[PDB]
Amino acid sequence: SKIMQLGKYEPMEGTEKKFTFWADKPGAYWVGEGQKIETSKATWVNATMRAFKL
Amino acid sequence: STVKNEDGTPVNLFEQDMVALRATMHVALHIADDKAFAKLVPA
């Protein structure tokens, strides 16, 4: 199998698999002495794959 | 709450990166005899 040759394997117990990855990373602000530090935010995203029977 | 930013918002020590010292004391006073005191004053 050329797919089994080139691709990456993944251990998969069930008929379905879930992946989650980082997507957004927090910003950063210059703040004056004693200024209010603005907030920032992290984010992730999900993907999934399923099996078929030959 | 007793000190205000330029914009008028109260100071937040965490969000604004500040430190503050509070000192407190309790004190009590009693005059045991109101007659026991006298005063000399210029005319």
Enter the tokens of residue A12.
């998969």
Angle at B6 between CA B3 and CA B7, to 5 degrees: 105
A43-50 and A16-24 beta bridge pairing: antiparallel
Using a CB-CB cut-off of 8 Å, the residues of chain A touching B18 are 34
Residue A50, SS3 per DSSP: strand
Residue A3, SS3 per DSSP: helix
| Beta carbons of A34 and B6 less than 8 angstroms apart | no
CA of residue A39 relative to chain centroid, distance:
22
Helices and strands counted in chain A (H then E): 1, 2
Distance from C-alpha of A15 to C-alpha of A49, rounded to nearest angstrom: 8
Distance from C-alpha of B13 to C-alpha of B6, rounded to nearest angstrom: 15
Chain B residues within 8 Å of chain A (Cβ atoms): 5, 12, 15-18
Distance from C-alpha of B26 to C-alpha of B43, rounded to nearest angstrom: 38
Using a CB-CB cut-off of 8 Å, the residues of chain A touching B5 are 36
Is residue A17 exposed (0-12), middle (13-18) or buried (19+ Cβ within 10 Å)?
A: middle
Q: How was this structure determined?
A: cryo-EM
DSSP-derived letter for residue B15 is T
| Beta carbons of B13 and B20 less than 8 angstroms apart | yes
Amino acid code (one letter) for B5: N
